Write a protein that binds this DNA or RNA. Structure first.
Lengths: 434, 52, 50
RNA sequence: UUUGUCACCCUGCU
RNA sequence: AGUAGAAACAAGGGUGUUUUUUAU
């Protein structure tokens, strides 16, 4: 079972790599581009727009502004002789249909679709701060490191449960019901079937997410509620503070983009023979031994842009620096402390001043030797199963995020023999979002 | 003003009137028929009405 | 008249103009035996009453 | 579920 | 559920706004 699953994963890896390869060859790119993150992301985008039914529908409707219908493309970069040049073409979609095809033995591959799109999604996570979103919903600020799957597509039957952090689900549910207030037909409609279906799966999976016998029943109650409303809302938000105190079973893992699948293939390796472990050492190794190009504007340290790339390409979810900077040879500096504006480039600003650089994608590495960490002693703000959750809050060990995934030991320690006792420098902050 | 909780809407009958849609759409559905217009259920006398 | 579906919670209104063409699988016995006796008089919504 | 993130009015015999 | 009894109520109408964007 698990063996076959790993085999299929490796096969999808191989497929994504081929795909990148073919795309490159056709566009008429060269080695550099094979390791050009920007163009890689452009291609990924393109393919994603491509495999979407709702997308197809809307477009066929009235595409209007934008590239021509049935085809599309992205800002694709290329130095001329001296400076880089940013173009844009609406690649025909049949081409894309056939490229995925050959790349995947004629077998559709949404599994890796989601793998890589998760990738770009968490990357955007390392880069942006959706503070407003929160209150925009009314949730009120929750300084948290979860909600990794907050900005991802709809279809992750499994990946969503894997990465969508309690916060994501809570926020979704808030809007869900919320629209079930602003709107009345959500239930006052034949659509009711689909609607309840959704509410229900969510309930179940989110309640299961955390691990507090107490709230679990509360969530059961919230679900059994029909015609949901505000009370449900207050319930959920507290419980989410309570989650701030309780681990979301949802566990983030690790990502690899086509750019990287691409030379992994163009270089020489058997992916279908050995599936790359998104929670093991294989991807780590491939990356450490992989070249990469990131275009960078002035006033942006290459050590800081590489750090930003690191978290996003390690599924950090704004993880704790107490190990993040360990796990990697160098010191990981806080978000507000880095000179960078993300990875994506806008169209509004100068392009001549684009220094390309090579991305530093490498890493040096409760009875258990690892010591889970919580820093929540703001009972005051917590105050700001009533007594059950209260007491459980009073004197207990909480946790923002548990990166039990990604066994990262000593990179020479390939299957976790010598857990090197961790040395955390308590001087620096623990949360990426501080 | 009482907060609105589950049991209170249940008892007070909130969100329970059927939706108003046209005949052009739900014309091919089953169990679609008139409102009931039957005689009420028959009953016989008791003893408490005189005592009251 | 007003029709209701108990299984999907739908209520709808039909006007008196459809009482010469509508399918008769929607009414109880009294309404059926009234419609099928008034039907030889319906002219554009009205009904001949001499 | 949805291409959505949130708002806005009106009416109580028409 | 309940009102209610030969058919209904458990509210009914319009107005919005929309190709990936770096952060608090």
């Amino acid at each position: 079972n698990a063996t076959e699953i790993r085999a299929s994963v490796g096969k999808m890896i191989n497929g994504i790599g081929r795909f990148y390869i073919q795309m490159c060859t056709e566009l008429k790119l060269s080695d550099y581009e094979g390791r050009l993150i920007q163009n890689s992301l452009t291609i990924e985008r393109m393919v994603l727009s491509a495999f979407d039914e709702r997308r197809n529908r809307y477009l066929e409707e009235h595409p209007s502004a934008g590239k021509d219908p049935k085809k599309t493309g992205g800002p694709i970069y290329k130095r001329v002789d001296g400076k880089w040049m940013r173009e844009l073409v609406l690649y025909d979609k049949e081409e894309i249909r056939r490229i995925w095809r050959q790349a995947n033995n004629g077998d559709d591959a949404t599994a890796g679709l989601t793998h890589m799109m998760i990738w770009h999604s968490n990357l955007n996570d390392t880069t942006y701060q959706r503070t407003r979103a929160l209150v925009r919903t009314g949730m009120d600020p929750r300084m948290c490191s979860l909600m990794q799957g907050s900005t991802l597509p709809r279809r992750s039957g499994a990946a969503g449960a894997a990465v969508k952090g309690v916060g994501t689900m809570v926020m979704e549910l808030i809007r869900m019901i919320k629209r079930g207030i602003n709107d009345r037909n959500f239930w006052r409609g034949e659509n009711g079937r689909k609607t309840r279906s959704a509410y229900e799966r969510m309930c179940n999976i989110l309640k299961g997410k955390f691990q507090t016998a107490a709230q679990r029943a509360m969530m059961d109650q919230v679900r059994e509620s029909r015609n949901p409303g505000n009370a449900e809302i207050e319930d959920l938000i507290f419980s989410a503070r309570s989650a701030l105190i309780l681990r979301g079973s949802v566990a983030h893992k690790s990502c690899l983009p086509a750019c990287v699948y691409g030379p992994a293939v163009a270089s020489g390796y058997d992916f279908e023979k050995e599936g790359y472990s998104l929670v093991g050492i294989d991807p780590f190794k491939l990356l450490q031994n992989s070249q990469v190009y990131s275009l960078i504007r002035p006033n942006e340290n290459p050590a800081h842009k590489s750090q930003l790339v690191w978290m996003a390409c390690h599924s950090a979810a704004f993880e704790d620096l107490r190990l993040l900077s360990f796990i990697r040879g160098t010191k990981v500096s806080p978000r507000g402390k880095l000179s960078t504006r993300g990875v994506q480039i806008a169209s509004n600003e100068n392009m001549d001043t684009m220094e390309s650089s090579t991305l530093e994608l490498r890493s040096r590495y409760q009875p258990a030797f690892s010591v889970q960490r919580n820093l929540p002693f703001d009972k005051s703000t917590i105050m700001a199963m009533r007594a059950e959750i209260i007491r459980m809050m009073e004197g207990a060990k909480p946790e923002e995020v548990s990166f039990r995934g990604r066994g990262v030991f000593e990179l020479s320690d390939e299957k976790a023999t010598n857990p090197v006792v961790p040395s955390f420098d308590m001087s620096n902050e623990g949360s990426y979002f501080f | 003003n009482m907060k609105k909780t589950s049991q209170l809407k249940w008892a007070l009958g909130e969100n329970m009137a059927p939706e108003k849609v046209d005949f052009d759409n739900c014309r091919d559905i089953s169990d679609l028929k008139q409102y009931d217009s039957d005689e009420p259920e028959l009953r016989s006398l008791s003893s408490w009405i005189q005592n009251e | 008249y007003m029709f209701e579906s108990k299984r999907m919670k739908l209520r709808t209104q039909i006007p008196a103009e459809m009482l010469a063409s509508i399918d008769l699988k929607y009414f109880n016995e009294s309404t059926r035996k009234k419609i099928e006796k008034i039907r030889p008089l319906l002219i554009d919504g009205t009904a001949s009453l001499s």
